[PDB]
Structure 1
Amino acid sequence: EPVYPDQLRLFSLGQGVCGDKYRPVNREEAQSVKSNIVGMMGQWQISGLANGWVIMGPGYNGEIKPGTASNTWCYPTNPVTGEIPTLSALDIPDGDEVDVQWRLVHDSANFIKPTSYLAHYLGYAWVGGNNSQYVGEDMDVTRDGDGWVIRGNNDGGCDGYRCGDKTAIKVSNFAYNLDPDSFKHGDVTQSDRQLVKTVVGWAVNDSDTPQSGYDVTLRYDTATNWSKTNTYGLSEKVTTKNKFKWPLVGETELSIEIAANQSWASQNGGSTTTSLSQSVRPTVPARSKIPVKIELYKADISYPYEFKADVSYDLTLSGFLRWGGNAWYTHPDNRPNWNHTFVIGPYKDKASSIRYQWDKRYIPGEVKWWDWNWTIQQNGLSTMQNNLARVLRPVRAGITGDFSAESQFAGNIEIGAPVPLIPLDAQELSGLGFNNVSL
């Protein structure tokens, strides 16, 4: 009886009080899904469990201990069972688009068989070629437009009513979303940090009185030169949903942002300079001075990279629905020719989402496409779980190439031990890479 974290719900209704149809999560259940519960809480949040127990936020190391809270972690009295497992991503090596698609679509155990069986369980007829007795075998896969069509070989003869009407499965509308968090890197070569300029001087306090509460601020322009190569052509189509700053490898600081909604192959380099402003607040005793210092650096890196691009696509099933046994919610018996498309990947809408339909299967008002409860009666809960798990298995494509950067930046305005009682040659700092160094 494993709790599903995605069904946990937090309520703020007093000690051990839950929303209708919910009951409080106990200490044991909380422990089994500790990482998931804590990852839904604020830093110093403290939330209630069953029977005078409490779970603390990530700031408190997520400790489960006795105590009181006016808010409560809760779980459905009648949870939804048999969630679809999320298997691990199917990694596909980098290459040209047509080659990455090819790999995926001719994959019998990972693609053809699960998508054929999906169609078969829904009630689609004759999902298999004439050269075999089993579903998802003897399956022709054909390039067609921007997509691919999988369909039982229809050559020769066959037995069974309307066996010539083989169902087809079209996969189309491929999209590739680069996930920054998947960032790997090869052997790091060029990786050094060199101090170029170390500015010095004094901050003098003459007035007979200890001096403090004055900032010796600094401002200047940093710089970052970067580039990168794309080993293959898939990169021409991959984008990233959100703009992100290129990651920080080694000690060489970087100020690079990858723009979202823009080809990865169209973002191969850049150059930026930003007006920063280090700061410091001294406390120099009466009639004394202090040694101030500001260091300037020049660093650069070079390393082969790799991100993961999440592959998504539309799955379109067309063929006729079997007499006296199909999953369409009206359960038609006149063998209608049917078309449905599921979006395999990010959620677009209810009609095209297996996971939405699956998880709402026990809400009558919601069943307007497939009757997933019927697939379970017919084929067993675990059988459907496994099939859907494989149909919905995240596919990932590698995005490779070489990277190389360079940046100049200042350090902290450090101030040292005072002594009983600062020049900025712009032409010098200009030629060092630091322009507009107005301290």
Structure 2
Amino acid sequence: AEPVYPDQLRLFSLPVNREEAQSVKSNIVGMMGQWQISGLANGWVIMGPGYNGEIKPGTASNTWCYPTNPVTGEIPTLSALDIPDGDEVDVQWRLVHDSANFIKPTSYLAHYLGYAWVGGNHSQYVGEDMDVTRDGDGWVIRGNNDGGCDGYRCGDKTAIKVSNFAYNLDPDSFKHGDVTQSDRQLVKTVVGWAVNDSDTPQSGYDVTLRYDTATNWSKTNTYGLSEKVTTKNKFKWPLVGETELSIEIAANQSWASQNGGSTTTSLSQSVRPTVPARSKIPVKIELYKADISYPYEFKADVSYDLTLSGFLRWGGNAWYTHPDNRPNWNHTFVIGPYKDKASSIRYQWDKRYIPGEVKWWDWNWTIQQNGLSTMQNNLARVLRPVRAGITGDFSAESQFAGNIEIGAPVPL
């Protein structure tokens, strides 16, 4: 009838229903020794491993219970972190070099999920002695490995990677400056006149210039068969003498398949002047290709992709199949608005009461190992909002530029 959160279940040896027990059966049965038997509400019994989790009518010396006035355990929302203004790279630098608000929370998440060796060689603690570096368009955070170490595969440290930054602009904050042009090349121009020899103003005039460009491709596969039968004989014919006669019959079959596609870009310009009675107006339209550049600024919310890369500990990890052969793992979370299920921490946390939805990380396992409030506080920090002012520059090559003009009237 109501969702059951496994972290709230409490076994005593001095009451859960049959329907409730079935919806989270594998959590209850997992928390049981082989051949053990425990009671449920209303005359029912839940049996442990070795009885394959069977739920049957009966009695028991001990009972599975769920508290009156339980809690949901949602992840709390913290206030935003303000980063001093700069361009995109300066703001990214300030975020990844923050120890208390970024480096440690991220390191603990990797640790709690089961990644091995999340730290450097000059400290015994998680998240300490970490090196930060710039790599291509992203950043890499890893424990320092210049000295020696002691442990199985202690030289194989876990990396934290940060990339794909995005901005949610405040609607009233965006501004831009001068737009400049360079390497201008002419495509085409038109000039002309609109003449009105009537006694009223007229607006029924139109001059339009249009330029289009396109590309295309295709691929074809053809297969076929052929069969032929021929006979040859020799005969004596009148006047001509001995003649060789040959007759040939043949047939063929063929099959073919094709796929393809195309892309088109188009730009057009028009002028439509209103002309006074007994007068004329000149018009002009021009089109150029040009390199375009301009400065800009805005205020926004900063989001990014977080990737964890390393090997998973033998003694236990949170991957739902719980592998024990120390495999190398790579997983990406999106810190920000929802995009998908595999990459959403909030989606997976909130659905921990439905066993059929547990396809990636097991968050019930992390709660049992570390405590509910431990996990809530860590995740609230990992998912904390970030805000900053941004300044920057736009540039692009071979874009379009144009000019449309209506001139002064000349009396007829």
2-structure distance, mates of 1:133, 1:247 = 113
Change (3 A) 1:290 1:360: same
Change (3 A) 1:25 1:110: farther
1-structure distance, mates of 2:233, 2:381 = 28
Change (3 A) 1:164 1:409: closer
Contact kept in structure 1, 2:142 and 2:159, CA below 8 Å: yes
Q: How many residues align?
A: 410
Contact kept in structure 2, 1:97 and 1:233, CA below 8 Å: no
2-structure distance, mates of 1:204, 1:85 = 72
Change (3 A) 1:224 1:122: closer
Change (3 A) 1:250 1:268: farther
Contact kept in structure 2, 1:224 and 1:408, CA below 8 Å: no
Change (3 A) 1:157 1:177: same
What is the CA distance between 1:91 and its match in structure 2? 1.0
Shifted more, 37-46 versus 383-392: the winner is 37-46
The runs of 5 or more residues in structure 1 that have no matched partner are: 14-23, 420-438
Contact kept in structure 1, 2:225 and 2:252, CA below 8 Å: no
The runs of 5 or more residues in structure 2 that have no matched partner are: none
Q: What is the CA deviation profile of residues 397-431 of structure 1, one whole-angstrom value per residue up to 9, with x for unaligned ones?
A: 12479999999999999999999xxxxxxxxxxxx
TM-score (structure 1 length as normaliser) = 0.47
Change (3 A) 1:287 1:42: farther
Contact kept in structure 1, 2:101 and 2:381, CA below 8 Å: yes
Specify the SS of the correspondent of 1:111: helix
Contact kept in structure 2, 1:191 and 1:250, CA below 8 Å: no
What is the CA distance between 1:72 and its match in structure 2? 36
Change (3 A) 1:221 1:365: closer
Shifted more, 251-260 versus 197-206: the winner is 251-260
Q: State the partner residue of 2:284.
A: 293
2-structure distance, mates of 1:243, 1:67 = 103
What is the CA distance between 1:348 and its match in structure 2? 1.1
Q: What is the CA deviation profile of residues 368-425 of structure 1, one whole-angstrom value per residue up to 9, with x for unaligned ones?
A: 1100111111111111111111110011112479999999999999999999xxxxxx
Specify the SS of the correspondent of 2:262: strand
2-structure distance, mates of 1:374, 1:299 = 59
Greater C-alpha Rg = 2
Change (3 A) 1:212 1:168: closer
Q: 1:156 aligns with which of 130, 141, 147?
A: 147
Contact kept in structure 1, 2:224 and 2:254, CA below 8 Å: no
Identity percentage of aligned residues:
100
1-structure distance, mates of 2:248, 2:49 = 29
Q: State the partner residue of 1:36.
A: 27
Q: What is the CA deviation profile of residues 306-325 of structure 1, one whole-angstrom value per residue up to 9, with x for unaligned ones?
A: 85311111100010111121
* Mapped pair 1:373 → 2:364: yes
Q: What is the CA deviation profile of residues 300-359 of structure 1, one whole-angstrom value per residue up to 9, with x for unaligned ones?
A: 999999853111111000101111211100111111110100011111100001111111
What is the CA distance between 1:207 and its match in structure 2? 37
* Mapped pair 1:350 → 2:341: yes
2-structure distance, mates of 1:240, 1:309 = 86
Q: What is the CA deviation profile of residues 53-110 of structure 1, one whole-angstrom value per residue up to 9, with x for unaligned ones?
A: 9999999999999999999999999987111111111111210221100100010111
Change (3 A) 1:184 1:368: same
2-structure distance, mates of 1:249, 1:313 = 94
What is the CA distance between 1:180 and its match in structure 2? 2.5
What is the CA distance between 1:48 and its match in structure 2? 38
Change (3 A) 1:243 1:142: farther
1 or 2, which has the higher strand percentage? 2
Shifted more, 209-218 versus 336-345: the winner is 209-218
TM-score (structure 2 length as normaliser) = 0.49
Change (3 A) 1:277 1:382: same
2-structure distance, mates of 1:225, 1:216 = 31
Q: What is the CA deviation profile of residues 174-199 of structure 1, one whole-angstrom value per residue up to 9, with x for unaligned ones?
A: 11221227899999999999999999
Change (3 A) 1:178 1:337: same
Moved segments of 4+, more than 6 Å: 1-13, 24-80, 181-306, 400-419
Contact kept in structure 2, 1:177 and 1:239, CA below 8 Å: no
Shifted more, 30-39 versus 178-187: the winner is 30-39
Change (3 A) 1:277 1:70: farther
Change (3 A) 1:240 1:139: farther
Change (3 A) 1:206 1:374: same
Contact kept in structure 1, 2:184 and 2:289, CA below 8 Å: yes
Shifted more, 389-398 versus 231-240: the winner is 231-240
1-structure distance, mates of 2:118, 2:302 = 25
Contact kept in structure 2, 1:241 and 1:260, CA below 8 Å: no
Change (3 A) 1:315 1:58: same
2-structure distance, mates of 1:72, 1:245 = 113
Contact kept in structure 2, 1:254 and 1:407, CA below 8 Å: no
Contact kept in structure 1, 2:294 and 2:393, CA below 8 Å: yes
Shifted more, 323-332 versus 307-316: the winner is 307-316
Specify the SS of the correspondent of 1:180: coil
Q: 1:270 aligns with which of 246, 261, 264?
A: 261
Specify the SS of the correspondent of 1:43: coil
1-structure distance, mates of 2:332, 2:395 = 43
Change (3 A) 1:264 1:40: farther
Shifted more, 221-230 versus 242-251: the winner is 242-251
Q: What is the CA deviation profile of residues 273-324 of structure 1, one whole-angstrom value per residue up to 9, with x for unaligned ones?
A: 9999999999999999999999999999999998531111110001011112
Q: What is the CA deviation profile of residues 164-220 of structure 1, one whole-angstrom value per residue up to 9, with x for unaligned ones?
A: 110000001111221227899999999999999999999999999999999999999
